[PDB]
Design a binder for this molecule. Structure first.
Ligand SMILES: Nc1ncnc2c1ncn2[C@@H]1O[C@H](COP(=O)(O)OP(=O)(O)CP(=O)(O)O)[C@@H](O)[C@H]1O
Lengths: 204, 225
């Protein structure tokens, strides 16, 4: 996959070359389109100790090699392209990196012709910017699950994200107000574990 | 009067309110009772279970038999019914009655038998009239004696826990039902004279006044109906 050509074709001006650390933190570097070909082949350098990877400030940089098939133009900002990456250290995948660790287990299972597929139901709350209370002061009842009123009160945000997921080809199919006040969930189709994992990281 | 007056002199205030705080134990007025001859003999003292006489058990039989109407008088306020049949408190027990039952040395019942020769009625609260309470208790107790009332079976269990696995009559759940019961109780009403009907009139009006008060709880739970 020719990221440089895609950038010109799709009008992508910056790429986020991203990896997930041991604490689930999304680590990313913002690279201008002019530099993507270099990063695609060689990876993007990061000081590994600065993320949750259990390294040393004395270690050589890790190189995050992007998976070109993971490319997502941010639906809310299409001029930026997100890529999930495998952390490499000293010329090979780094076993302490989550995505690398997953791919290792998947390869052992695949060797036995067993392929994991999964789907995730990622519940979340919508809260005030300061985090102190839910976003909807009118969502108060003891049993709020599937509350039509509170659900529609957040239609704009929920509908925007659902429609992004349609466009992204994830096959979204239901959006719910969940059992806690202020809590929601948006489902999408299961897939090969690696695909779902990347989608999961991006979704949040 | 003394307690209120003195508290006030100390910059404090005393209340005998039955249930002044939602999640805390309420104010009881536990009443210990026995009947004596003029010669000075305690008629409750006896050779029956727990050192009680048949007279004692009959008197109790009257308390049990007339419990619903008696509740109107010894639990005379709307608030009284938040002390009775209350949800468990922070301290782990309400220490008030829920059911028309009696035990031995057991504080989970309507009546407790603390020792030989007396009964503890745990039903009354701090709003109980100092004169009407003993009067209604006596009226009921006398009818029990006169009719040789059977109080039924003593329950040696914790009613708060091991009470759902037994047949026990529930106390009136509000002032309205208590007053309804007092009005239907010929012995109590008749025993108290014209006081009973006048008392019932006032308590009915109090209950109606209570009904008309709009509460914050109803607003929170009903505005979105
Ligand atoms: N054979 C399969 N293997 C793995 N995941 C699957 C699967 N079949 C369906 N899924 C996925 O599991 C997730 C949940 O599916 P579904 O909504 O049908 O279950 P459920 O109804 O118990 C969820 P909820 O309680 O929120 O409605 C979805 O992502 C779905 O794609």
């Amino acid at each position: 996959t020719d990221l440089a050509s895609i950038a010109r074709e799709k009008g992508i001006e910056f790429f986020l070359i991203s990896f997930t650390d041991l604490l689930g933190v999304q680590r990313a570097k913002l690279v201008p389109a002019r530099a993507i070909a270099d990063m695609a082949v060689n990876g993007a350098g990061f000081a590994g100790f600065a993320a949750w990877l259990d390294m040393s400030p004395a270690d050589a940089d890790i190189l995050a090699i992007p998976d070109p098939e993971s490319l997502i133009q941010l639906p809310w900002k299409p001029s930026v392209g997100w890529l999930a990456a495998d952390v490499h250290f000293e010329g090979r995948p780094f076993p302490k990196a989550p995505r690398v660790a997953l791919k290792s287990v998947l390869a052992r299972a695949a060797g036995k012709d067993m392929h994991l597929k999964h789907g995730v139901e990622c519940e979340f709350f919508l809260i005030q910017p300061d985090g102190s209370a839910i976003s909807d002061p009118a969502d108060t009842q003891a049993k709020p699950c599937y509350d039509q009123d509170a659900l529609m009160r957040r239609f704009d945000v929920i509908a925007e994200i659902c429609s992004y997921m349609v466009d992204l080809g994830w096959g979204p199919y239901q959006n719910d107000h969940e059992d806690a006040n202020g809590q929601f969930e948006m489902n999408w189709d299961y897939a090969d574990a690696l695909v779902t994992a990347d989608r999961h990281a991006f979704f949040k | 009067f003394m307690v209120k007056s003195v508290a006030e002199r100390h910059g404090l205030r005393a209340t005998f309110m039955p249930k002044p705080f939602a999640h805390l134990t309420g104010n009881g007025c536990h009443t210990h009772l026995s009947m004596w001859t003029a010669a000075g003999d305690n008629l409750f003292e006896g050779d029956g279970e727990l050192g009680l006489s048949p007279t004692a058990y009959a008197f109790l039989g009257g308390l049990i038999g007339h419990a619903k109407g008696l509740t109107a008088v010894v639990n005379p306020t709307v608030n009284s019914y938040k002390r009775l049949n209350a949800p468990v408190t922070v301290s782990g027990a309400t220490w008030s009655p829920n059911t028309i039952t009696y035990g031995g040395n057991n504080r989970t019942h309507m009546v407790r038998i603390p020792d030989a020769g007396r009964l503890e009625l745990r039903l009354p609260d701090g709003a109980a009239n100092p004169y009407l309470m003993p009067a209604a208790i006596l009226a009921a107790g006398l009818d029990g004696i006169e009719t040789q009332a059977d109080p039924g079976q003593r329950l040696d269990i914790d009613m708060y826990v091991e009470g759902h696995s037994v047949e026990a009559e529930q106390l009136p759940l509000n002032l309205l039902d208590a007053v309804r019961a007092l009005e239907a109780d010929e012995v109590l009403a008749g025993g108290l004279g014209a006081a009973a009907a006048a008392f019932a009139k006032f308590k009915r009006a109090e209950w109606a006044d209570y009904k008309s008060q709009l509460t914050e709880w109803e607003r929170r739970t009903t505005l979105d109906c």
